[model samples]
Target: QPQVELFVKAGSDGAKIGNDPFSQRLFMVLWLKGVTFNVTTVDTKRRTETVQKLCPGGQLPFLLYGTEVHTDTNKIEEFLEAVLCPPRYPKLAALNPESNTAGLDIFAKFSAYIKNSNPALNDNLEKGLLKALKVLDNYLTSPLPEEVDETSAEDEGVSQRKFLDGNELTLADCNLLPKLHIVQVVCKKYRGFTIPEAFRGVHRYLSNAYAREEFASTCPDDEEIELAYEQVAKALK
Candidate 1:
């Protein structure tokens, strides 16, 4: 089959990637693996006639492989792993290794934590977010490769050990990073929240992932994120 086609919502910048974190997660996953694909941006409110026909209500970030419509980020990831994994492209690096599942739920936890809370109840909400952050931080900071190659950690870009599970980026990372970006960008603007300084490992993880080409190419700018949040969060609570 030819390269898969990913159609996501368009941003204010028009053809640029959308502000939807759910959509970017898949885009980054495909990009991190060097998968060849095409991104066709569409308006958020109304589906183009072709897409409307592909997915009745038109789920954002749906991929069409051989004209089969696969919607939702998680479902699409499953489809991608099947098509791109062993037997077909065995030489391509696997994106969902067993080790990569450790921090996979952090994105969901972050999403729940970021929903608007009443002023008095926010302390509890923030506490839950920190607990998850602490776990991720401790996991990220746990061990260094112990082969007398200590100084090799200086450049995160070329280093293989910076990500969650292993050296190469994976679907787990693709799933988490965009939402974490939302945590940092929207949580701060809408909730006056920032990741605790105590979570340096989490911060370091963010720096490494943000520095990657897959992220730089697909990540939405701050303005785009703020605008989107204004729609979802501004009127809530």
Candidate 2:
């Protein structure tokens, strides 16, 4: 079998891989699916020709496997799903239909909130984010639907679920984790605003997600993440 190669942006300091959120998502997925892959860093300042030739959109974090190349994170995720765990992919992809909606929407809204970059716009953005966070909090804490099974209740234990959708980890959790992590980091570093106690459900979910070895393995250093956002904050100013 051909080895999978992930091409990502070269970190500011070089040598460190998986700093960007999209790239981090891919890393997390690969870790969760137990895929063996190699990382290739492309210098953003000097990669125009390279990116245009290989990935026409000039997107970093593209995947190359044998003769095929994948650009978008979603496309890469789908490809990984089909290759890594075909049987469970459909079920995992389809799990918790309503939960998936809430997770994706919150992730999208949070992404927009951080990208605003304008300090003045942050007030409104924070309000919007808080609103969305509340929705996520409620969704996580709500009672499970009758249709969902509870056969694994004993194995799952008394602890709250580690994932957004019940006991099993799903694509929604993978998609939301990196974005949520970034949001928490940026808000605290740039805004000095911590996630409130009101969001216990959200906090618990984050705690559980971050505790996983896959998350620790794939997550960039905290200072590195802060520096990345600092650049964003500086660029907007």
Candidate 3:
């Protein structure tokens, strides 16, 4: 029989979901149902044996389909497009099509850029990563072009929608949500830096995204993740 198995770590849910695993998985649930596939979720509880069996190298978000197992989300999407809904599911295809391949490229570059150059990180050994935090703040408060009037703030900088493809939700959003959640935690702890005034789109986007029942369900509130990180930071000093 053919079935889809999604293997992920237990505590990894929020980590995977950018601090809201539950919500991130909810998007996957929606994606699976929309594609009309039998989906299964498996928790890996940081077990090496499970990781070896499910994800090969012990990666989370691994998918097992029939005899073949997939670890990369993009690869899984490619397989799904080739097998399930080829040309019709344009959005899905646009996200994972073998042709464009830009999504993965951009995803990797952005991940590298943010991780290595986050403004929130410090210059010296202890320099605060305020720049990355500022970038985040900028995105969260900026309005989209459609939502802006003359009175709107100058749209000189990066728009939040560019990352999420101009206001519409895609797999990119799902993939990026977890990272932003981490940034949010950093923002809050470092300086109590709330979302900045210009980055309204991010704020709006996240607000709406979180309100969805599936997103809320998949990425439930986890004050502990934040608290735990805080504890670790304190111990670093």
Candidate 4:
């Protein structure tokens, strides 16, 4: 048996897991695959001695697997897929192999829109964010459209195609959900804007994300995300 340790940013309590979306994305991945792991929250903002010792820069959300240490969310995802998915743990569905980039940049535009304290930039930022959301919406409502392999188990599964790549929750869904959640709360709270009801595809996709116990359990509660916006947005430059 291997020991897995996850270190993420702390919340208002300075001890428990915080509202950091990136950390929760990793958390969702592990949880979805049923990987057993313990957690440690660090005050990355204040940068304690232990933190500096771990990382020269303030970047956080590192993971420990047995004696091996991993950083960088993408690298960690790649490593985890390499070791934990497929034959290694075939029962645990691999979230990789579905090479789709739909909604990938939604978070970047969302970050820019939320942090836009300037009036002139706000309109353009919102416009950019809207376009990305539209792209994701279009992609979600339609069929996969890409080529399929008969041998792939993903194709033969009885589950309906409801997720980013397919029925099985892939890295795309894991990566997008928390960011999208932040967008919904932060965008509405700061700008008094909401995803129009006409974006039913987006709404349906969100419904799927919220319905999943793994995503819902790991997702930050409304208050946590709200407090995070207040704490981080006020100082955003």
Best by lDDT: 4
lDDT of 3 by residue, 117-188 (tens): 344442332223334444444544444445444442654554444334444555555555654655555446
The digit string of per-residue lDDT tens for model 4 on 138-230 reads 776555545243434753522235677766777777788888888898878877878888766688878888999878887767777888888
List the candidates' TM-scores in order: 0.79, 0.79, 0.57, 0.81
lDDT over C-alpha atoms for residue 12 of model 4 = 80
Question: Which candidate, 1 or 3, would have the higher lDDT against the true structure?
Answer: 1
How many backbone overlaps does candidate 4 show?
Answer: 0
**Alpha-carbon deviation at 130 in model 1, angstroms:** 1.5
| TM-score: the better of candidates 2 and 3 | 2
Per-prediction CA RMSD (Å) = 4.4, 4.6, 6.9, 5.5
Question: Which 10-residue window of candidate 4 scores lowest in summed lDDT?
Answer: 90-99
- Against the hidden true structure, what lDDT does model 1 obtain? 0.72
Q: Write the number of the candidate with greater lDDT, choosing between 1 and 4.
A: 4
> In candidate 1, which residue pairs get closer than 3 Å at backbone N, Cα or C atoms, i.e. clash?
160-167
- For residues 160-226, what per-residue lDDT tens digits would candidate 2 score against the true structure? 5557777766677777788788778877776676778978778889888877876666777778778
